[PDB]
Design a protein around this ligand. Structure first.
Ligand code: CYC
Ligand code: CYC
Ligand code: CYC
Ligand code: CYC
Ligand code: CYC
Ligand code: CYC
Lengths: 160, 161, 161, 160, 160, 161
């Protein structure tokens, strides 16, 4: 959260939180009820949001799901989707926190090092998360979609 | 560092589950208590220095542990003990804002007992000093936040024995 | 650092003797095996990254110790375990070229067990991972150098228990 | 050796030995048989090589072996020669290694600090090692002498 | 002392004390008998020197000893004087040592941090030590007064 | 660091007392002995290097602990042992000037035993070496200062067992 990000910064200058910081954690706790609503809605449709988003990807990148590409046979493909559900879960986290750190520490610090070892295309993964951002955003209001949108863009942008 | 929220998600992430039903509430509970925390924090920031003065007077001054031989005797010692008390209030207050003792165990309680037994700093007295800050603090921030400041205050204490 | 040769002279220098009769042979033995070492080394340098990929797949992937809770779960953890395996192959390979375990005990095995028991890294699994590198490596460099790579590979293992 | 000197350099850049380094340890192991021959020959004549080389020195520097100079009476002189045999042994070492380090670490890192404490002339010691390089070199072939020559020169050069 | 201050400086350059330093500890041990005389005389009159010096202060700064000032009622005032006797004792120390360090380490390293917490005026304390320097100096010879004078001035100067 | 004087005041300051009656004498005693200390110090500064040479010859040279295997064998080892002896004389001499063992326990004897048992340095022999410096030193500075140099010399010794 920002509560956590403020304390840290403040302890670095060895001082009590500045009024401005408090003004922030104040107006951030007031945004809570909503935040949780957004996470709750994505987590009730997590099942579908991943499936079609899963198809939308395999259509744009048939090399992923045919002979010679990473996700091949129900075997490999089944896990590819798994990877995608992993990230949806991390999105609801960032959202509830009002921060992106949870995503960073849980599934961003060395995504490339990991995937390169497995020989899976990262740009392909990036399109897999993009697709999701659209399936999920379709279930949200005009605003609950803009904000929830950030957390999806931050990921894809690191996938490069 | 962790706060009440980052705390909730981490515990759900270890199991792989999406935000639970009970989990969604902890986040709510925290959110509901947010203001009063920020409110209380501002107060203990305004008095921070007096909230130490009084405590010292109530427990450490005019006693054996300030006169020659008492381990705060010395214009360097005295300043060093207030310096510590000042720490304890600045960290107690964070822990309170974060709604979790995480910073305390992280940037406070680690080996503190050691150096202390090591330098000769009197454990029992420093605890009485902070215990006195609880009272003095509970008087300006209120009973609600005071009970909240209390717990983290008592946390810093139990972390010396 | 020491190698098979510097190893021979040091042991003769502690006694003050000139290069012994048995000593002259160890130096010969080493010299005779030189090439095959350099040869094998080049190979494991060309595959170094794949010689890790396969091992991981054979022992660490699709198991409890990668899913949530398994101590490599985490995009930071995964990268950290390959990072280690990469180390083990780069040092095993040196030790092999040097014809002595000297670097291993010097810049590897010192306290490694500690930090591990300390962070929670699963000893048993990391050993299985490297044990798997032996097989995968013995397949491209040959049986001769593989038995030579093996011993240093098994050295890194015994140095965790 | 160079095997040992390569590994070190390589671990400093955190990488597998470069082809060039390997090219070296390769052509160095091929020089082995010879190297050992050279060491073997010096170590069979170590006895004589030190004696005459010992005389050759006491002639050029009679101050060493008369009243008031370090090596005096069979007592002190006996050890002076000892010191000289010490260095012959370290030469065969450097030779077998194809490196000079063994000499450095065993009898060069603070030779001066040691000898100054004992009040023995270093330039005199340097001439004692020089003489040897000639007695020993006389027992070697045109080439086995050039290379073996290095290890003797490196010492004397540090004796200053 | 200077013995102590020399050793330290000398160990920093890793060498035996220079002749100049020794020349100092030499001419400093010769000043001893006197030094002790000065300390002895102040310590026999410590009782009075603090009292009148105590009055002289309360006259110049009646705000100290009336309603609302730190030293108020026999209660607070009694300790104020105590504070003043503390410093007299530290003066005899510096004197015997021929150094000022004892004063620094015992009652100067953070005097302000301490007093600010207690809300006591430092400039007022400074005048309390000044007054003493005059009461005590009146009991000393022309010279025993100049030197003893230093240690009192060094304090007051830090009280700001 | 502490010296005979700073030592006296510190002990009186812990009790809060002004310079005692017995205290005033220790300061006198010290002052009375001042010169001879400075005098002796100058002498052991002039011979400092020879006062090590002789000691070495009397106890460490031409023995098992210099020939191959003896832990000073090695052009690096030899220089390292004189280096130490040099330390012991430079600190012994300070302690003597200060009239207190304070520097010794401060910048000398702390953990020295450890590293030693650790590297293999022979305790018994290094003590004999310094014990030999006492004799050699007592011969040029005199019996008076020698007994004074002795005690601090024996202090450095007892601080290895
Ligand atoms: C799907 C959109 C794409 C794809 C996926 C794919 N992934 C794997 C294997 C693994 N993926 C992970 C991922 C994570 N581990 C983590 O800790 C986190 C952060 C929470 C993530 C995201 C891991 C660890 C594996 C290893 C197997 C395991 O889980 O034990 C595969 C399998 C590769 C194989 O042949 O073995 C695939 C196919 N592949 C694609 O082409 C899509 C673009
Ligand atoms: C006051 C209530 C009591 C007291 C305290 C006292 N403390 C010290 C020295 C140290 N205290 C600490 C503690 C902290 N340092 C920190 O940064 C933090 C927050 C993360 C804490 C809690 C440390 C590290 C020291 C030593 C290093 C230093 O000097 O800062 C002393 C001084 C001991 C000395 O002489 O060196 C004293 C006197 N003394 C009392 O009588 C009270 C009961
Ligand atoms: C992989 C087979 C297993 C595994 C490993 C794992 N290791 C770490 C962390 C560290 N590993 C080391 C080891 C080395 N560092 C070196 O420089 C060398 C060569 C000289 C070695 C052998 C160290 C020092 C660390 C800690 C410091 C660092 O992060 O680099 C982790 C991370 C633990 C954490 O969360 O911080 C992991 C996961 N994990 C497995 O499941 C495998 C069985
Ligand atoms: C002879 C050419 C010259 C000479 C020699 C001389 N040396 C000594 C005494 C010692 N020499 C050593 C030498 C070494 N120790 C080592 O570890 C190494 C590296 C392997 C070397 C070379 C040592 C340790 C001693 C001390 C005695 C001992 O061994 O215990 C002496 C004796 C001096 C004396 O009076 O005691 C002499 C004479 N002197 C010359 O003038 C020649 C030029
Ligand atoms: C008198 C000239 C002035 C004055 C003094 C005053 N002091 C206090 C309280 C304390 N003073 C000290 C001082 C020291 N502690 C040390 O270790 C040293 C170095 C040796 C010094 C100088 C301390 C520790 C206290 C705290 C009480 C205690 O001793 O336990 C007070 C009392 C304040 C109160 O209301 O409690 C006063 C009045 N005040 C003046 O106005 C004069 C200028
Ligand atoms: C000589 C009488 C004996 C002897 C000594 C020997 N010592 C070492 C190594 C070290 N000695 C010290 C000691 C000190 N360092 C200091 O700065 C001070 C003054 C504050 C002291 C007393 C230390 C720190 C070391 C290690 C670090 C270093 O090398 O300086 C060795 C070397 C061991 C090695 O091979 O690394 C030796 C041989 N040896 C003897 O045989 C004598 C009995």
């Amino acid at each position: 959260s920002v509560v956590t990000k403020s304390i840290v910064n403040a302890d670095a200058e060895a001082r009590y939180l500045s009024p401005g910081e408090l003004d922030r954690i104040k107006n951030f706790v007031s945004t809570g009820e909503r935040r949780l609503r957004i996470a709750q809605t994505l987590t009730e449709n997590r099942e579908r949001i991943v499936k079609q988003a899963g198809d939308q990807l395999f259509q744009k990148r048939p090399d992923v799901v045919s002979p010679g590409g990473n996700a091949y046979g129900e075997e490999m493909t089944a896990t590819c989707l798994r990877d995608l559900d992993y990230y949806l879960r991390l999105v609801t986290y960032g959202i509830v926190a009002g921060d992106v750190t949870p995503i960073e520490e849980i599934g961003l610090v060395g995504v490339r090092e990991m995937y390169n070892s497995l020989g899976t295309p990262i740009p392909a993964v990036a399109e897999g998360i993009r697709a999701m951002k659209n399936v999920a955003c379709s279930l949200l209001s005009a605003e609950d979609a803009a904000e929830a949108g950030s957390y999806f863009d931050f990921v894809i942008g690191a996938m490069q | 560092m962790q706060d009440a929220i980052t705390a909730v998600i981490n515990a759900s992430d270890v199991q792989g589950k999406y935000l639970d039903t009970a989990a969604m509430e902890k986040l709510k509970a925290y959110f509901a208590t947010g203001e009063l925390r920020v409110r209380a924090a501002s107060v203990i920031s305004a008095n921070a220095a007096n909230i130490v003065k009084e405590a010292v007077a109530k427990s450490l001054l005019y006693s054996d542990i300030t006169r020659p031989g008492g381990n705060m005797y010395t214009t360097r010692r005295y300043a060093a003990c207030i310096r510590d008390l000042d720490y304890y209030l600045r960290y107690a207050t964070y822990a309170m804002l974060a709604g979790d003792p995480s910073i305390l165990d992280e940037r406070v309680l680690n080996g503190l007992k050691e150096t202390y037994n090591s330098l000769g700093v009197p454990i029992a007295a420093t605890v009485q000093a902070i215990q006195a800050m609880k009272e003095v603090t509970a008087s300006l921030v209120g009973a609600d936040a005071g009970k909240e400041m209390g717990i983290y205050f008592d946390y810093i204490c139990s972390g010396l024995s």
